[PDB]
Amino acid sequence: EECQVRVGDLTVAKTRGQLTDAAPIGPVTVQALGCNARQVALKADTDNFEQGKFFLISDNNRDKLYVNIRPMDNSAWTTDNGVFYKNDVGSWGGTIGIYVDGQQTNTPPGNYTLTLTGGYWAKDNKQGFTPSGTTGTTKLTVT
Amino acid sequence: KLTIESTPFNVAEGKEVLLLVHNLPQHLFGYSWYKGERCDGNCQIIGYVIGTQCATPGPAYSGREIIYPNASLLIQNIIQNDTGFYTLHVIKSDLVNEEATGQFRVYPEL
Numbered sequence: 001e002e003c004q005v006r007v008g009d010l011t012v013a014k015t016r017g018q019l020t021d022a023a024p025i026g027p028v029t030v031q032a033l034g035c036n037a038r039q040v041a042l043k044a045d046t047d048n049f050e051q052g053k054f055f056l057i058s059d060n061n062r063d064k065l066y067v068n069i070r071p072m073d074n075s076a077w078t079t080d081n082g083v084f085y086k087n088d089v090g091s092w093g094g095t096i097g098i099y100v101d102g103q104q105t106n107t108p109p110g111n112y113t114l115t116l117t118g119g120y121w122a123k124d125n126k127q128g129f130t131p132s133g134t135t136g137t138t139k140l141t142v143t
Numbered sequence: 144k145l146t147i148e149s150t151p152f153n154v155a156e157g158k159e160v161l162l163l164v165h166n167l168p169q170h171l172f173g174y175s176w177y178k179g180e181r182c183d184g185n186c187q188i189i190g191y192v193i194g195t196q197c198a199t200p201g202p203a204y205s206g207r208e209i210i211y212p213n214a215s216l217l218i219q220n221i222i223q224n225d226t227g228f229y230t231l232h233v234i235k236s237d238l239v240n241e242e243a244t245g246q247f248r249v250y251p252e253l
């Protein structure tokens with residue numbers, strides 16, 4: 001038994017310009033098993049997470065964009081440029097969405113893969129995160 | 144519009160109540176029942192993904208909540224604290240997660 005967060009994969013066709021400040025581009029129904037006294041947190045895979053920051057990358061690995069995973073107005077989560085987590089204790093069951101940090105102005109997109117893994121978080125700032133559960137690979141495709 | 148009805152409306156302590164859902168939309172991704180009058184996240188009762196029948200309990204899940212593919216929720220062993228409003232969130236693969244709220248009352252017997 002551990003804090004297992006089920007993050008689902010999602011591929012959607014959208015532009016970087018549709019991301020106007022806070023635009024929930026796809027509602028992911030995520031539920032966390034356990035964590036009665038632990039904080040639930042979302043962390044991106046090491047291929048999408050560097051220096052304690054999460055971002056999406058293109059095929060040419062030149063265009064790097066940072067995206068914050070926030071709740072679809074379901075609860076209050078602590079925003080971090082690397083690991084997103086809620087201060088409120090207890091399990092969680094709602095919908096999360098990918099929000100862009102600052103309007104991108106629809107910079108020429110293509111294919112971006114961002115692997116987000118759910119799990120729990122320990123204390124704060126120290127980056128004591130552990131991905132337990134399911135990992136959700138979100139694919140950003142322009143069409 | 145999505146309509147939630149409670150049958151019976153006047154439930155007795157020690158019985159079950161069936162929250163029937165009427166006018167269910169299409170493109171169902173998953174049903175989510177919450178305890179309140181809005182779509183929260185910390186006060187979720189239960190989530191049910193029809194596609195894979197993947198049901199996940201929430202913080203407000205007592206274990207008396209029985210969810211059906213028609214989004215209806217049957218709660219057994221109804222207590223006095225059950226008296227109130229319940230809200231359903233219809234997660235659809237089209238962003239429109241149509242929300243609806245229903246309510247029922249509980250009374251003691253003998």
Ligand SMILES: *SCC1=CC(C)(C)N(O)C1(C)C
Binds near residue numbers: 185202203
């Ligand atoms: S919605 C308030 C609430 C929170 C939690 C501690 C999960 N609960 O059992 C209730 C439903 C009272």
Ligand SMILES: *SCC1=CC(C)(C)N(O)C1(C)C
Binds near residue numbers: 008192194195196197
């Ligand atoms: S139960 C959730 C689930 C299982 C599996 C068949 C692997 N899936 O694709 C989803 C994520 C729907």
Ligand SMILES: *SCC1=CC(C)(C)N(O)C1(C)C
Binds near residue numbers: 024027095182
């Ligand atoms: S319950 C309110 C709500 C939230 C969100 C998921 C953004 N929605 O589409 C609605 C308006 C149903």
